[PDB]
RNA sequence: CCCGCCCCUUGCCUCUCGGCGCCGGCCCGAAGCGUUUACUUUGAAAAAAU
RNA sequence: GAAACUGCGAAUGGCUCAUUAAAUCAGUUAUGGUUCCUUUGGUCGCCUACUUGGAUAACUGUGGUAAUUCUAGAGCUAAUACAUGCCGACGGCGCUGACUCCCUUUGUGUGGGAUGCGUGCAUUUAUCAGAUCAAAACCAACCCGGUCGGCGGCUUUGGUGACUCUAGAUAACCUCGGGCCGAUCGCAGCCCUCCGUGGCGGCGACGACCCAUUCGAACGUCUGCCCUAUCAACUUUCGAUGGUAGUCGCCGUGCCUACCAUGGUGACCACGGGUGACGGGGAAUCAGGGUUCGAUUCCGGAGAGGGAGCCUGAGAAACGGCUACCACAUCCAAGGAAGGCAGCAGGCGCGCAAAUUACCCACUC
């Protein structure tokens, strides 16, 4: 027999699971944020070594 | 390092005792070391020494 | 009850060794499955640290593949023919691992004519007419030709499939253990394999 | 016996720096699973009543646990033998204290009381990087928490500083010579002293070398090495003697040297 | 009885990638090892009680 | 709040030293060849849902046997026992292409497109990728800087000494009747185009899947052992050694089977026999070198009268679990029933030879 203390335990089970959705997007958002400002230094070898065989080259 | 910290506490004990002197205080003066010394220190011995008793034997009642 | 102890048996000078402790739990055997054709029959098996084995009993479908193409579709297995193993089981149609067996070959020239929209090869002409010749030229029109035409000048198929195709069977090569896993799975032969498995066939039986 | 695992453990086979005697009874605690190795574990109890001596008997130990004043790592623990280990903090909150486990310089867990602020982050080594599904890392601690998506360029043997409540990493070192490091296994225990020199091998372990400021050179296996801080920088309160470690004619010099052992 | 010198001196190079230099150019630590063992010497590594 | 269902434990401890000579065991190494109750940390949205289905115990009442912690028949009623199964959020992704639209007849350059099917993890199979070394010259089709003959500039998950690793892509498979994705319970609050509903929030408790961790477990490497030659050759289809494939098992493996090869070990002591031999940490004596002992408090192993088989469980070939034989021995209304002190005491027997049928969970766990 439903009470009103059994359906809140039903709204708390769905409250939890939709939380849980929304901390894994938060989460991977920052990560790709971060994830995308170092592949700087990706850019920053491939540079070097171009810069490398010029520098060499230099005389 | 094993000669230097057990000579040093072995001769420390030595001394605190009384039966052997800082005077001394070397590895080859605990050779020179004899019964009679050891005897000396004893409480019946000190009794009678440094206290009132008439022999030896009444120190020791 | 049977065992699996390394404690029985020789050593390598000839010597022998002898128990000093009674058969324990983590050595265990529990006699083959000897799985067959026909319809399914399956018991479940509780092992050690839990889980399930299935073994299955009289089974009658594989999942095969034709890799090259890229197509595995759900055909049904129908019988034993050569078995590397031993011999004894081909004439008695027991299936084990590395079995060579026969299958239906229907899906695959379902999926072959949907895909390269030609026919394979056939008994005679008026054997599509009635119907196979509805959905092998289709209203489209709208891709006659651009998609066709690369389906004209690929795909070849090798000869040893195709001869077999007509009959409605192909030889395939159990991969997988069934009396473990539960199922039986494959893949269906080509060139070289192919060869090899119809020379030691035709060399023992017809 | 053998029919399956263990639960007595005695008090003759327990791992020496507990400081356990023996004319008390046969057993002794057993560290119950946990995140920390049992013989690295330093079990609840034995800091609660064979060390602080606010309880005297064990069921006294259980009725302070029961009240719940107890937390590790800011979440609460109740049990009498929860297994912690090195680089955790302990929070009495009703007498305002404050503890880190550390390695005295004789290679035993000693009483280290810290401020409020230290007390809200620990030093979490790196042991394993692994990629789960769906292409995200991870990374594995020896406190064996598994903190998802850290920032790609930290490597095993680097070291981490947690925040106790969030998770998410606040900064880290990148394992090299020249910084600072503390001994936490092997037969050197304690001991404090910049990396200097690292040595490989194919497989079959491999040894880093170590030195100090005092000058001594000792060296101890791979897995025993533990980052603390930037070179000659510890980021932790480090408990008196700074893992120099003396030798045992020295130390015999210095309470006779100041004539102390009251006060 | 730690550097070097007569020919040798921790035998060589080759170099190239990531630091140190000096004024593009040049120098020297780390990388393969000295035919193999034993032997000897140092480290690492080891349950407690006794 | 007795009882009873349900959950958890009884696989720890305790005791003995019979078997046991490369076995056990000790030091050292290996799982990249594997399993793991539990803890800790992560993982937890492709005519019923205001909550689904029907029985069992205690209980009530009636009984049977010489006799048991036996059990029958009848009448009730539960669930985190037992058995079912929807809601929510799929605004996505891929492949067919009814077709349709624009410009160069076409081709091609183009843009859209209904109708379908597929579309989480776990499972099994197949296939693909898992890329970065050292530079240019012209001809054919081509982006951009930029032109009405081509010049300069691009394409790449993570990790180990090493993995057929990890993660990714594609095509399917599905354990059904035997993978997952909550019909569970206790503390304490709110807000309502508003009158107890519709909305939603805290603090817990419980359960379950996978990965990691802890406690281990199991196999494997190298080296180490008391006496005997009045024990010198032994081992093989009743597998001995190896090869190839399979079966079985948690996994590796002649562990097992088929087929095939003809090896393996030894005077550096094999093989066989003996042991008042459990192994080691140790103990007694001793100048140096040794000799003898180790049943016995720690660690490892083996076993519960002798043998064999097996249920339950994460874990047992368990014996204060079960089933049978053999050896013992008890009760009985003679029809049947029941048993295992090398657990603590105690008794008999054996002997040269060994204690109280005591008190108590306060300490230690």
């Given at each position: 027999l439903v009470t009103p203390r059994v359906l809140q335990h039903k709204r708390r089970r769905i409250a939890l699971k939709k939380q849980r959705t929304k901390k894994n997007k938060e989460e991977a958002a920052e990560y790709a944020k971060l994830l995308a400002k170092r592949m700087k230094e990706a850019k920053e070898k491939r540079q070097e070594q171009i810069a490398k065989r010029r520098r060499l080259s230099s005389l | 390092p094993?000669?230097?910290?057990?000579?040093?506490?072995?001769?420390?004990?030595?001394?605190?005792?009384?039966?052997?002197?800082?005077?001394?205080?070397?590895?080859?003066?605990?050779?020179?070391?004899?019964?009679?010394?050891?005897?000396?220190?004893?409480?019946?011995?000190?009794?009678?020494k440094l206290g009132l008793a008439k022999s030896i034997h009444h120190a020791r009642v | 009850?049977?065992?699996?102890?390394?404690?029985?048996?020789?050593?390598?000078?000839?010597?022998?060794?002898?128990?000093?402790?009674?058969?324990?739990?983590?050595?265990?055997?529990?006699?083959?499955?000897?799985?067959?054709?026909?319809?399914?029959?399956?018991?479940?098996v509780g092992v050690r640290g839990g889980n399930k084995k299935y073994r299955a009993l009289r089974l009658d479908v594989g999942n095969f593949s034709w890799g090259s193409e890229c197509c595995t579709r759900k055909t049904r297995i129908i019988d034993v023919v050569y078995n590397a193993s031993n011999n004894e089981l081909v004439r008695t149609k027991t299936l084990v691992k590395n079995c060579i067996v026969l299958i239906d070959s229907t899906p695959y020239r379902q999926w072959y004519e949907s895909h390269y929209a030609l026919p394979?090869?056939?008994?005679?002409?008026?054997?599509?007419?009635?119907?196979?010749?509805?959905?092998?030229?289709?209203?489209?029109?709208?891709?006659?030709?651009?998609?066709?035409?690369?389906?004209?000048?690929?795909?070849?198929?090798?000869?040893?499939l195709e001869e077999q195709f007509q009959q409605g069977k192909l030889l395939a090569c159990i991969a997988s253990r069934p009396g473990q896993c539960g199922r039986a799975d494959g893949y269906v032969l080509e060139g070289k394999e192919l060869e090899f498995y119809l020379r030691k066939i035709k060399a023992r039986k017809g | 016996?053998?029919?399956?695992?263990?639960?007595?453990?005695?008090?003759?086979?327990?791992?020496?720096?507990w400081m356990?005697?023996?004319?008390?009874?046969?057993?002794?605690?057993?560290?119950?699973?946990?995140?920390?190795?049992?013989?690295?574990?330093?079990?609840?109890?034995?800091?609660?009543?064979?060390?602080?001596?606010?309880?005297?008997?064990?069921?006294?130990?259980?009725?302070?646990?029961?009240?719940?004043?107890?937390?590790?790592?800011?979440?609460?623990?109740?049990?009498?033998?929860?297994?912690?280990?090195?680089?955790?903090?302990?929070?009495?909150?009703?007498?305002?204290?404050?503890?880190?486990?550390?390695?005295?310089?004789?290679?035993?867990?000693?009483?280290?009381?810290?401020?409020?602020?230290?007390?809200?982050?620990?030093?979490?080594?790196?042991?394993?990087?692994?990629?789960?599904?769906?292409?995200?890392?991870?990374?594995?601690?020896?406190?064996?928490?598994?903190?998802?998506?850290?920032?790609?360029?930290?490597?095993?043997?680097?070291?981490?500083?947690?925040?106790?409540?969030?998770?998410?990493?606040?900064?880290?070192?990148?394992?090299?010579?020249?910084?600072?490091?503390?001994?936490?296994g092997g037969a050197n225990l304690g001991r404090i002293g910049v990396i200097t020199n690292r040595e490989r091998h194919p497989g079959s372990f491999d040894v880093v070398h170590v030195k100090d400021a005092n000058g001594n050179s000792f060296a101890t296996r791979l897995s025993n090495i533990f980052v603390i801080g930037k070179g000659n920088k510890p980021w932790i309160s480090l408990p008196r003697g700074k893992g120099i470690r003396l030798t045992i004619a020295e130390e015999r010099d210095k309470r006779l040297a100041a004539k102390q052992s009251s006060g």
């Open positions: - | 094993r000669r230097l910290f057990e000579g040093n506490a072995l001769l420390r004990r030595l001394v605190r005792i009384g039966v052997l002197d800082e005077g001394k205080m070397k590895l080859d003066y605990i050779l020179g070391l004899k019964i009679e010394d050891f005897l000396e220190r004893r409480l019946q011995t000190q009794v009678f | 009850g049977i065992s699996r102890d390394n404690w029985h048996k020789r050593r390598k000078t000839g010597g022998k060794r002898k128990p000093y402790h009674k058969k324990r739990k983590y050595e265990l055997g529990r006699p083959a499955a000897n799985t067959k054709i026909g319809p399914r029959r399956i018991h479940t394979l090869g056939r008994k005679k002409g008026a054997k599509l007419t009635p119907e196979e010749e509805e959905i092998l030229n289709k209203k489209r029109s709208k891709k006659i030709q651009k998609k066709y035409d690369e389906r004209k000048k690929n795909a070849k198929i090798s000869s040893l | 016996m053998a029919r399956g695992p263990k639960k007595h453990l005695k008090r003759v086979a327990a791992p020496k720096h356990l005697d023996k004319l008390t009874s046969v057993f002794a605690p057993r560290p119950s699973t946990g995140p920390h190795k049992l013989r690295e574990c330093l079990p609840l109890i034995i800091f609660l009543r064979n060390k602080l001596k606010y309880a005297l008997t064990g069921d006294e130990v259980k009725k302070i646990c029961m009240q719940r004043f107890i937390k590790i790592d800011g979440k609460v623990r109740a049990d009498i033998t929860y297994p912690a280990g090195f680089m955790d903090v302990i929070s009495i909150d009703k007498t305002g204290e404050n503890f880190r486990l550390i390695y005295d310089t004789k290679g035993r867990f000693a009483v280290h009381r810290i401020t409020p602020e230290e007390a809200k982050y620990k030093l979490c080594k790196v042991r394993k990087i692994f990629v789960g599904t769906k292409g995200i890392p991870h990374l594995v601690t020896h406190d064996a928490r598994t903190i998802r998506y850290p920032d790609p360029l930290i490597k095993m043997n680097d070291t981490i500083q947690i925040d106790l409540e969030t998770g998410k990493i606040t900064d880290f070192i990148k394992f090299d010579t020249g910084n600072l490091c503390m001994v936490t």
